[PDB]
Amino acid sequence: LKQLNLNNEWTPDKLRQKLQTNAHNRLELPLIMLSGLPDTVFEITELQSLKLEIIKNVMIPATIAQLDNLQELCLHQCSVKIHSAALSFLKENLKVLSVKFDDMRELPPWMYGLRNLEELYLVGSLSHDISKNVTLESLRDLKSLKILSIKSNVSKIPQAVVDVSSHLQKMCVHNDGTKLVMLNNLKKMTNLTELELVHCDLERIPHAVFSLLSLQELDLKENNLKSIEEIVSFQHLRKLTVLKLWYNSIAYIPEHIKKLTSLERLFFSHNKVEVLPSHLFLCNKIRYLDLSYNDIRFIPPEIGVLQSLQYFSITCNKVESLPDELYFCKKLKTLKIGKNSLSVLSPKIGNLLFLSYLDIKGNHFEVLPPELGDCRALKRAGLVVEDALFETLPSDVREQMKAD
Amino acid sequence: LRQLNLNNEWTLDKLRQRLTKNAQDKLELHLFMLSGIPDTVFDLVELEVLKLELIPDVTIPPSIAQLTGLKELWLYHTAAKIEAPALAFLRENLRALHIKFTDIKEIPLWIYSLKTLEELHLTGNLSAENNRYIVIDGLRELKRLKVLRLKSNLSKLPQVVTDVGVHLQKLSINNEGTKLIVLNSLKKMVNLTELELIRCDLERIPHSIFSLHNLQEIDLKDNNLKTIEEIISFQHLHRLTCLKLWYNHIAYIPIQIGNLTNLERLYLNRNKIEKIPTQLFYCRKLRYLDLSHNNLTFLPADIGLLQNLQNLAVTANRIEALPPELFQCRKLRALHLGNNVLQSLPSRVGELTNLTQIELRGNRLECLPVELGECPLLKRSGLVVEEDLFSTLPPEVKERLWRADKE
Amino acid sequence: LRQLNLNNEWTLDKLRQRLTKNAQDKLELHLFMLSGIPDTVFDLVELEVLKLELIPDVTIPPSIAQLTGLKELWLYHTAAKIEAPALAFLRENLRALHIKFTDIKEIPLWIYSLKTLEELHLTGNLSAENNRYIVIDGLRELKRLKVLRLKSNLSKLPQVVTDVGVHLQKLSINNEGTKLIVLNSLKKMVNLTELELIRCDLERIPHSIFSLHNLQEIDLKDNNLKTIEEIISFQHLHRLTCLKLWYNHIAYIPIQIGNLTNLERLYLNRNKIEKIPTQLFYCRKLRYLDLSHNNLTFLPADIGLLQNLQNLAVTANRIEALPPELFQCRKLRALHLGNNVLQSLPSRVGELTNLTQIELRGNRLECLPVELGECPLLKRSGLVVEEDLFSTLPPEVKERLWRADKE
């Protein structure tokens, strides 16, 4: 009778007008605060995703076979059951899953029965009894799983992660203040390319992270790293181009970063570094160098080697003296020096032909020079300056960036 | 008693709030799972399209004389009996009838008496033993029929449409997996401007489309077209402007498509094409080049020659880098670059002005360049992108785009 | 009790509520599906068109003599009973009378004694078995009748119609998909000044049309004419001011039709005309013109010859530009040029200050030229311009347009 009232209450017109898009650019139905699924859901055969939010004890019929365009499910606090032919259809059709489990029962055991799974987002609150999860160890059934984002307290890395060592390409954990241990599993990653260990309570770089051999993007955000020392073996990560180590407590960068000559994306913002090293600038391949909100006192003059640097965010730092060697590098496109400790701006800035971003807000300046008109790629919307200093510019210099 | 009560409960104001609008911008009313049809529905005057779905054995009252704006009668699984004055009114007013039925006896027999009807949508199997097109042999009585949609699993195309197609202008046949033995029978059917053979499993383009000359919109969706080499003869079709060769098994494009200079929309999406020959890029009249969900790995620079291109949708491809010549065409209105492997989007997109919606979410895009904010008509609804990718733009440029969302 | 109850139902206030106006700008009162006629509806002296649609058991009391402006009686499916004083009142005020009937069942009998009316309409099948046009034999006493319009799906031309039509001025024949066998019997119909043949599906012009020197309007709409080879015999006539060959399939219009100088209005829209010849536009006094929904690939030379025109309909064809040919015309007021492939509007259209309307429902314009800002006479409600196209005008020009919309 509840199912009949559900079919009467939610006409197909109401579900059609409920239709919208999700964060993955798919047609998603955000079914929120309901008793079950209506039978008029499956009349919208063009649907590509359903967001089920707090809809418990739901039994999915076989009529889901009409959802040919369906490739994603997002289960938010839903203890959902499925029927056998529907299970087979979603085994042969589904690609993306995202299940949140405020309670353990809200995580369904049926969802691991598929094999066409590519992307999984295992947000929730996992218990510390992680190795006991045979439901987790069923990810070996998935023969295409490449994205695995577990937003839960993952103290010990599961052997479920061991069973998906090869096919995985993106590995994301938000451990939320729990130390990540049992490193041999992350040693067993063979073909993993993106390791996203966000806030795994790592007191330093784990030896497991360093036993990776095919990594391309490493993120240790909100992990209280003490040092970057083992780098004599980062040379085996020639496939690595992205190093994400910001919002951390690192205080220095030794010369060892010279081992990786394929490093492009470097993140060291919001760190405890008080003086930028010159041997960091010795590497010239680095194109993205992020050091915003740091404690940097000054920039050594070896930064002229960093010609390929297209991003040098030194904004909101303690930097008082900026050397002229940085202005020799003309490829720097996104440069932010806002809220810094500078006194005057360098007149020689016109050699930066490719310079879209310039941010100088908050920093104390005496007089804006006319040489700010010398920048070619600069834009008035791209040149974030106060209105008072916008007044302190020549009218031709105003129009140089104001008129497109 | 049920009919009278249904007339009583379905009040006028609740019907007014029940009124909606369709894709054709006509006032609409969907009657789904009722005992009969309310007379207060028939009291309406502003209604244009009434939708009769799952109505068991109802009779149309003559109060349809009030429904003057009524032009589209939508019959879904509805066995309708008809009153004679209402029959005359529908003969002189009703112009579009869609009939879906599960049994060949469910179709009303008074649809042949309609004379002002031009659009017919016979969805549901017309092919049955001794009822194979003999039931619809009365569409010879139909004279002004121009649109004839047939989602009916037809094994062979009827002889009755060969008789009727002198005046027919659109033939949308959906067999849902049954091949047509066309036998070049469209030669007597000379007035078609559109032909939509969808889900027919043809596996080859027949020659009946080639014998015709008046076609301007050709759709061959889901016909399992492995090879499309016949298109060299399509220069004979001097009026074609929309060659919708999508949802097929097309793995390559022959160079003779360069002879097709009259194409304006070339819908090749959801195909297996891996390389675009440059001869396809000769056609200056292409406006909607949708090559999404395909195997393209690179985009040729000759796309800059296609100045009339507006919506280039290469969604879910293998294109790693956009050439600068792509931004040579200044008429790009909707650059659907989503789900691709675009490493970085060049700043030349700041030169584009007609861009209204660009899709970059799901790419390998490292950061969003500042010049993307130079497009005037672009807004947040148009600029769909990941939030962290949005954060890479300057907060003044982000303020400009957030204002375009606001203003 | 029944009359009192229906009197309490329909008071004078609700009658003024239901009062509308028709296409003739006359006061109409749509009375539909009433068990009886009201008396308050005859109390209102303002009423001019008394509408009686599908009202059974009709017995009109002499209070219809209370009506002052009663010149129209739109009785549809109504069996009217009228007493002798009310009939005599009808014999001095009633002028126009429309009948909708199902054969002999719903045909009134008092209409023959009416000898002072001037207009009459009929609708309903008449060619019954053993009763071939025998029910309309009593219309001989009507001497002041001037307008007779028929829509009665006639399989053959009634001889009674030919005998009756001696005192006729306007006659329209609608067969809704039936052959009309004139058989040169319209030679007696010398007094006809407008001959409408709507959906006569003739496919040939009858030779009796070439004998009447009073016809100013010839209407052959939806006659499925493909090759007009009978206009050479139209040269004998010197009265036809407007030919109506629209909603047909005329592939080409021959040269000889350019010899008709008296033609002033060409309705040829929704036809199969590929190229309209310049010699045809030697007649420059073409005030009205309808050429929409056609296959014209360019607007030809002798449109420059045209000078005494007021509109051209160029909707839905293959014309790319407004050439100097349309620009040598200095009296055009409405441009029906929508959903076209018109590339641009050149400059001189910005001199056309007397521009009532333009139609641009999907046209391919780059932008409205600043010369259109030269005319404040064209207002935002006056012209029909797409919102994205309209916004490209300067902010001063757009503000002036909204101002003139208010002003």
Side-chain angles (χ1 to χ4, degrees):
Chain A
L1 157 52
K2 290 276 188 169
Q3 189 66 237
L4 262 283
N5 297 335
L6 213 50
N7 235 14
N8 296 325
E9 181 41 64
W10 290 137
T11 69
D13 189 21
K14 216 88 62 59
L15 303 186
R16 283 263 166 75
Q17 78 207 57
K18 165 72 101 160
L19 289 172
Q20 74 166 25
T21 59
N22 48 22
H24 296 281
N25 267 343
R26 305 289 179 272
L27 197 59
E28 193 182 64
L29 262 176
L31 296 177
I32 304 171
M33 311 334 296
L34 206 37
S35 58
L37 86 168
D39 302 338
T40 57
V41 167
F42 301 131
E43 310 178 14
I44 312 184
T45 68
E46 58 267 18
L47 191 71
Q48 302 170 0
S49 175
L50 320 90
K51 161 92 73 53
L52 301 189
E53 208 165 52
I54 323 181
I55 325 187
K56 294 168 178 51
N57 71 352
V58 173
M59 181 45 168
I60 312 293
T63 311
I64 208 167
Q66 291 180 26
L67 306 190
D68 294 307
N69 302 16
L70 190 76
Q71 276 196 1
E72 178 182 343
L73 314 183
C74 182
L75 281 293
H76 259 305
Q77 281 47 271
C78 291
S79 62
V80 52
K81 329 173 303 297
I82 210 189
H83 150 285
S84 306
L87 165 60
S88 68
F89 174 79
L90 291 198
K91 186 178 178 181
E92 295 155 355
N93 276 67
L94 209 82
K95 307 307 184 238
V96 196
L97 264 163
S98 183
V99 174
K100 184 163 177 58
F101 42 75
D102 188 23
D103 175 75
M104 183 176 282
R105 165 62 189 129
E106 293 163 354
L107 173 58
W110 90 268
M111 71 155 268
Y112 311 94
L114 328 169
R115 90 230 184 280
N116 281 27
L117 257 193
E118 258 87 4
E119 322 175 17
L120 181 46
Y121 308 126
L122 204 72
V123 53
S125 58
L126 265 173
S127 61
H128 279 90
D129 300 345
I130 272 176
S131 59
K132 303 183 188 176
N133 293 337
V134 198
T135 84
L136 261 179
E137 215 175 53
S138 303
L139 309 173
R140 62 180 295 275
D141 303 346
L142 329 178
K143 45 93 173 172
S144 300
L145 179 74
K146 51 187 55 178
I147 302 181
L148 195 41
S149 178
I150 306 110
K151 202 272 192 191
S152 203
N153 40 303
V154 191
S155 59
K156 158 288 176 192
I157 299 133
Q159 329 289 329
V161 177
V162 163
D163 300 353
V164 202
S165 63
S166 56
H167 294 62
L168 219 59
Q169 296 165 8
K170 208 210 171 280
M171 222 296 305
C172 188
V173 191
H174 295 248
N175 201 358
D176 304 347
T178 318
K179 165 66 187 176
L180 191 88
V181 283
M182 152 47 62
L183 302 180
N184 304 353
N185 310 341
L186 222 60
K187 301 184 62 181
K188 288 165 190 172
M189 321 334 299
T190 49
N191 303 23
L192 254 184
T193 63
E194 304 182 30
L195 191 66
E196 196 94 358
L197 306 170
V198 174
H199 190 36
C200 279
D201 203 11
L202 304 175
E203 276 69 37
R204 210 193 142 283
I205 321 166
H207 160 83
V209 164
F210 225 106
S211 299
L212 266 295
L213 289 183
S214 304
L215 219 56
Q216 304 176 2
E217 164 183 328
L218 168 74
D219 186 23
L220 297 191
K221 198 180 62 192
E222 312 164 16
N223 271 317
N224 304 333
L225 310 191
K226 284 161 187 173
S227 62
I228 36 171
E229 188 54 279
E230 297 150 304
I231 318 190
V232 285
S233 293
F234 270 147
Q235 58 194 357
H236 320 299
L237 312 184
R238 43 202 64 93
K239 211 59 182 177
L240 203 152
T241 64
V242 180
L243 198 55
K244 296 192 168 184
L245 304 176
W246 83 116
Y247 287 134
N248 282 346
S249 302
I250 282 302
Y252 59 93
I253 305 177
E255 317 182 0
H256 305 309
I257 207 68
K258 73 188 304 176
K259 289 299 179 179
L260 177 48
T261 57
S262 301
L263 171 64
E264 185 202 3
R265 269 272 179 145
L266 193 43
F267 279 98
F268 266 93
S269 83
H270 288 82
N271 277 222
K272 220 182 299 172
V273 194
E274 85 296 332
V275 165
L276 262 190
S278 60
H279 54 239
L280 160 87
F281 308 141
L282 277 187
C283 316
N284 70 324
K285 161 70 168 70
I286 311 177
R287 185 158 297 182
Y288 194 101
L289 186 49
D290 203 0
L291 295 138
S292 322
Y293 286 81
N294 277 23
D295 313 318
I296 304 307
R297 160 68 170 204
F298 80 104
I299 305 314
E302 284 275 344
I303 203 181
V305 191
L306 262 169
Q307 179 66 230
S308 294
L309 198 54
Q310 291 180 2
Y311 179 93
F312 187 50
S313 181
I314 207 67
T315 175
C316 311
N317 280 20
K318 297 182 177 176
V319 184
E320 188 262 349
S321 58
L322 266 201
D324 296 322
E325 306 292 316
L326 84 88
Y327 309 98
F328 289 144
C329 308
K330 43 213 89 52
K331 295 182 60 177
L332 176 52
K333 155 172 202 274
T334 311
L335 168 63
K336 315 182 208 180
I337 315 159
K339 284 135 288 175
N340 215 337
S341 302
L342 281 177
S343 303
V344 305
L345 192 43
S346 173
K348 174 251 292 177
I349 198 166
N351 92 90
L352 281 143
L353 203 168
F354 334 113
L355 183 52
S356 65
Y357 214 159
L358 267 201
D359 170 40
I360 63 160
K361 301 282 285 308
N363 203 345
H364 184 258
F365 274 120
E366 295 212 70
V367 162
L368 291 190
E371 276 69 41
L372 323 184
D374 301 9
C375 317
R376 184 66 268 184
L378 191 71
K379 213 57 67 183
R380 176 71 206 103
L383 178 76
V384 194
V385 187
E386 319 163 20
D387 293 353
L389 289 184
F390 166 65
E391 189 269 311
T392 70
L393 283 176
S395 63
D396 273 327
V397 175
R398 290 168 203 240
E399 186 147 6
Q400 263 207 267
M401 321 295 158
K402 172 201 300 179
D404 229 355
Chain B
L1 179 57
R2 275 198 328 270
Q3 217 287 323
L4 228 57
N5 256 322
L6 216 73
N7 295 345
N8 201 10
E9 46 213 290
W10 260 117
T11 71
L12 273 193
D13 296 354
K14 168 193 32 174
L15 290 167
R16 301 293 180 83
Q17 77 101 17
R18 195 37 199 76
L19 279 165
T20 44
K21 298 191 70 178
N22 62 347
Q24 309 185 28
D25 303 346
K26 302 178 173 183
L27 218 54
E28 221 175 24
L29 212 49
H30 194 273
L31 300 184
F32 181 80
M33 182 175 288
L34 293 186
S35 61
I37 60 167
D39 221 44
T40 41
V41 170
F42 265 68
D43 199 19
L44 201 41
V45 48
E46 44 258 21
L47 173 58
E48 313 183 47
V49 181
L50 93 168
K51 325 172 72 73
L52 289 189
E53 186 152 345
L54 281 174
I55 289 303
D57 202 288
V58 86
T59 64
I60 299 184
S63 56
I64 211 158
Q66 264 77 4
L67 277 170
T68 88
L70 171 141
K71 323 279 262 173
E72 309 204 345
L73 168 87
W74 257 17
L75 289 196
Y76 285 123
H77 295 133
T78 294
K81 282 85 190 170
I82 171 55
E83 210 71 34
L87 180 53
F89 185 87
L90 288 192
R91 168 171 313 109
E92 295 143 345
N93 195 1
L94 160 47
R95 70 192 306 210
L97 171 43
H98 292 216
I99 318 183
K100 179 154 48 55
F101 52 85
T102 47
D103 188 17
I104 211 152
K105 312 173 198 61
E106 291 181 6
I107 172 176
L109 300 184
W110 60 270
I111 70 136
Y112 317 118
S113 62
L114 289 183
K115 312 282 184 273
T116 44
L117 211 72
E118 313 99 4
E119 301 78 37
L120 200 66
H121 287 61
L122 295 170
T123 82
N125 184 29
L126 330 178
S127 302
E129 178 195 356
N130 301 344
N131 287 320
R132 197 185 173 185
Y133 320 133
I134 316 297
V135 179
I136 66 156
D137 263 341
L139 320 168
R140 304 296 308 275
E141 194 178 350
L142 269 283
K143 192 59 189 179
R144 214 186 274 99
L145 211 68
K146 305 158 195 182
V147 174
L148 193 44
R149 200 262 189 285
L150 302 168
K151 175 172 51 143
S152 298
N153 309 268
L154 311 173
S155 298
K156 191 197 297 291
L157 79 84
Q159 76 287 346
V160 80
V161 280
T162 71
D163 305 345
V164 168
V166 183
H167 29 284
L168 265 173
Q169 294 188 341
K170 178 188 161 187
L171 196 67
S172 182
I173 310 190
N174 192 351
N175 284 347
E176 304 120 299
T178 311
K179 183 177 175 55
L180 285 315
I181 308 100
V182 189
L183 228 57
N184 288 359
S185 52
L186 301 191
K187 303 200 57 49
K188 332 291 166 186
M189 174 179 230
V190 282
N191 208 7
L192 294 175
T193 63
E194 176 141 44
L195 178 71
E196 308 177 5
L197 296 185
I198 77 161
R199 293 187 52 183
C200 315
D201 202 3
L202 295 186
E203 297 117 351
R204 92 166 291 281
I205 300 180
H207 307 95
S208 67
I209 330 169
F210 265 146
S211 304
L212 195 37
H213 275 268
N214 268 339
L215 279 182
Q216 55 176 343
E217 275 83 67
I218 302 156
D219 191 358
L220 301 181
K221 159 181 183 351
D222 211 0
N223 286 354
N224 296 3
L225 261 165
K226 318 170 191 307
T227 60
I228 49 155
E229 275 282 345
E230 303 98 319
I231 58 174
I232 171 181
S233 296
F234 258 128
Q235 205 274 336
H236 297 207
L237 255 74
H238 293 285
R239 291 285 186 273
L240 89 177
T241 50
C242 187
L243 200 55
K244 280 184 179 182
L245 307 180
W246 56 354
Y247 274 129
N248 298 320
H249 312 336
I250 313 176
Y252 72 73
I253 309 300
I255 87 161
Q256 37 266 52
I257 194 78
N259 314 353
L260 280 190
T261 60
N262 312 301
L263 305 175
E264 298 186 7
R265 310 147 60 96
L266 170 89
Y267 274 120
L268 303 174
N269 48 300
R270 291 272 175 89
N271 289 345
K272 316 174 179 300
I273 327 163
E274 53 183 0
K275 52 171 172 60
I276 297 184
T278 62
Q279 293 87 11
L280 182 137
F281 261 17
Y282 291 165
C283 180
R284 282 200 69 263
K285 294 191 194 176
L286 287 177
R287 199 177 193 179
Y288 224 121
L289 189 68
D290 202 327
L291 261 289
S292 298
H293 280 116
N294 274 249
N295 313 346
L296 284 310
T297 324
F298 85 111
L299 216 169
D302 181 302
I303 190 70
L305 177 63
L306 313 185
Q307 287 299 315
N308 282 350
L309 170 60
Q310 287 200 341
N311 293 21
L312 175 91
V314 289
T315 310
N317 266 327
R318 215 179 170 182
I319 305 170
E320 286 184 352
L322 298 192
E325 301 218 353
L326 186 31
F327 313 104
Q328 278 171 355
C329 160
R330 294 299 200 270
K331 288 192 183 181
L332 300 150
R333 189 188 63 182
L335 268 163
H336 283 206
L337 269 296
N339 210 262
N340 211 329
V341 284
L342 184 47
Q343 308 162 355
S344 181
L345 174 130
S347 65
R348 285 200 49 179
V349 86
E351 307 156 350
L352 309 180
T353 315
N354 288 349
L355 184 32
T356 57
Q357 42 179 120
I358 191 165
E359 304 181 344
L360 302 167
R361 164 201 295 182
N363 287 70
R364 312 306 298 108
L365 190 37
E366 301 181 6
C367 62
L368 253 67
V370 185
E371 281 77 21
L372 207 169
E374 297 190 358
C375 313
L377 261 203
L378 255 178
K379 45 184 180 175
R380 153 79 202 209
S381 323
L383 176 49
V384 48
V385 83
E386 310 173 2
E387 301 325 329
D388 60 333
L389 288 181
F390 216 163
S391 78
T392 67
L393 286 144
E396 212 81 336
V397 173
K398 263 201 304 185
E399 260 318 310
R400 171 68 180 180
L401 293 163
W402 280 332
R403 210 148 55 95
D405 196 13
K406 298 155 204 302
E407 86 204 353
Chain C
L1 167 58
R2 182 172 43 230
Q3 295 260 18
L4 228 50
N5 169 42
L6 270 203
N7 223 59
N8 294 116
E9 289 297 320
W10 305 155
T11 193
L12 208 35
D13 312 0
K14 208 174 204 166
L15 287 163
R16 273 174 211 103
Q17 167 69 266
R18 270 145 321 142
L19 274 181
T20 55
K21 264 200 170 185
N22 58 354
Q24 297 86 356
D25 295 353
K26 299 181 179 178
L27 190 66
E28 246 204 317
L29 200 36
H30 198 204
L31 299 184
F32 185 83
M33 256 186 174
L34 312 183
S35 163
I37 84 188
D39 306 338
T40 57
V41 75
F42 307 174
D43 180 39
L44 197 44
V45 305
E46 313 165 356
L47 173 63
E48 306 181 50
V49 183
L50 175 34
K51 170 90 211 100
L52 305 174
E53 198 166 349
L54 201 42
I55 176 180
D57 294 346
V58 153
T59 311
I60 316 175
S63 74
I64 206 182
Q66 198 167 1
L67 298 186
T68 57
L70 176 73
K71 270 86 204 172
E72 273 262 20
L73 191 63
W74 263 29
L75 62 80
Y76 285 6
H77 308 115
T78 289
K81 314 302 297 314
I82 291 173
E83 310 92 13
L87 193 61
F89 183 86
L90 255 65
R91 291 180 193 181
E92 50 207 355
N93 288 114
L94 161 74
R95 224 55 68 184
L97 202 163
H98 292 50
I99 310 175
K100 193 52 181 33
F101 52 88
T102 309
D103 53 82
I104 189 54
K105 169 66 189 57
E106 287 161 334
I107 287 178
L109 326 171
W110 42 266
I111 59 169
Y112 319 124
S113 49
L114 264 292
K115 292 189 296 293
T116 68
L117 62 96
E118 295 186 358
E119 311 160 19
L120 206 156
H121 288 223
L122 289 175
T123 300
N125 180 34
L126 301 158
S127 52
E129 186 179 355
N130 305 348
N131 291 318
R132 295 290 311 201
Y133 320 115
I134 211 179
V135 290
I136 46 183
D137 300 4
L139 302 181
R140 319 189 191 280
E141 287 283 335
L142 281 75
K143 296 176 301 297
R144 273 172 241 186
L145 178 56
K146 293 162 188 178
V147 181
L148 189 72
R149 325 260 203 85
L150 310 174
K151 178 182 167 59
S152 296
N153 69 2
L154 315 160
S155 300
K156 298 201 290 281
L157 192 59
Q159 186 249 351
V160 191
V161 158
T162 74
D163 307 337
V164 154
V166 171
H167 44 253
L168 221 56
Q169 298 180 359
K170 194 133 181 213
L171 165 78
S172 61
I173 308 171
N174 317 64
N175 293 153
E176 47 272 10
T178 321
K179 190 44 79 185
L180 183 67
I181 316 183
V182 199
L183 219 52
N184 291 1
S185 60
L186 205 76
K187 302 182 174 179
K188 193 82 65 182
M189 192 46 248
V190 197
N191 323 91
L192 197 49
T193 59
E194 298 80 51
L195 169 66
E196 291 66 350
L197 300 180
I198 314 293
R199 211 179 143 189
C200 274
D201 52 80
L202 288 175
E203 301 192 8
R204 53 75 181 171
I205 308 179
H207 307 86
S208 57
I209 305 190
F210 317 125
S211 171
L212 318 183
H213 204 349
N214 289 339
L215 285 176
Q216 311 111 17
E217 314 189 6
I218 274 295
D219 199 345
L220 306 184
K221 172 215 182 211
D222 208 3
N223 282 25
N224 264 353
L225 288 157
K226 298 175 183 60
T227 54
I228 36 179
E229 310 311 306
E230 307 94 351
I231 52 185
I232 173 66
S233 304
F234 266 121
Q235 286 174 352
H236 297 90
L237 289 201
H238 288 285
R239 195 75 163 264
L240 57 101
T241 59
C242 38
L243 89 172
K244 309 279 141 278
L245 311 179
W246 91 81
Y247 261 55
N248 292 355
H249 305 288
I250 301 185
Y252 83 110
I253 310 190
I255 284 306
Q256 51 256 43
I257 208 161
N259 303 135
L260 302 153
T261 65
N262 51 311
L263 152 72
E264 302 166 343
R265 159 157 33 89
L266 174 128
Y267 281 11
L268 255 295
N269 67 332
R270 218 211 70 97
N271 263 277
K272 279 189 186 178
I273 173 67
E274 170 53 61
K275 48 161 296 294
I276 196 85
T278 83
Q279 179 282 329
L280 262 65
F281 301 121
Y282 224 82
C283 327
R284 329 159 176 205
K285 50 216 99 57
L286 267 278
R287 292 191 289 141
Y288 291 11
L289 187 135
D290 217 356
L291 213 48
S292 287
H293 293 357
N294 288 343
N295 317 304
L296 202 45
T297 53
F298 69 102
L299 189 130
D302 263 343
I303 295 309
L305 220 56
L306 296 209
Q307 187 58 282
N308 276 11
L309 75 79
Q310 88 90 8
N311 49 16
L312 269 77
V314 178
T315 307
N317 57 1
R318 258 62 73 203
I319 297 196
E320 318 291 310
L322 304 159
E325 287 76 335
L326 252 185
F327 283 164
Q328 267 184 2
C329 304
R330 311 165 188 178
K331 217 183 163 185
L332 62 107
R333 313 179 320 176
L335 294 135
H336 321 144
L337 321 195
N339 46 88
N340 246 0
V341 283
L342 160 81
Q343 302 299 134
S344 191
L345 321 183
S347 67
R348 201 219 62 110
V349 78
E351 161 272 309
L352 288 173
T353 325
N354 292 359
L355 220 48
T356 65
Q357 292 176 342
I358 54 178
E359 165 187 0
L360 304 175
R361 316 299 88 220
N363 83 290
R364 301 169 57 183
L365 180 61
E366 181 70 16
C367 63
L368 308 153
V370 289
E371 283 94 343
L372 303 187
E374 208 264 295
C375 314
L377 252 190
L378 59 95
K379 312 166 187 185
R380 181 56 184 99
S381 59
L383 89 182
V384 199
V385 52
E386 306 179 15
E387 299 292 328
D388 51 350
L389 284 184
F390 162 70
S391 76
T392 198
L393 276 168
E396 270 153 289
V397 166
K398 264 199 299 187
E399 193 261 334
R400 207 212 297 111
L401 274 155
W402 297 327
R403 166 209 320 181
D405 216 24
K406 313 309 170 180
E407 167 188 2

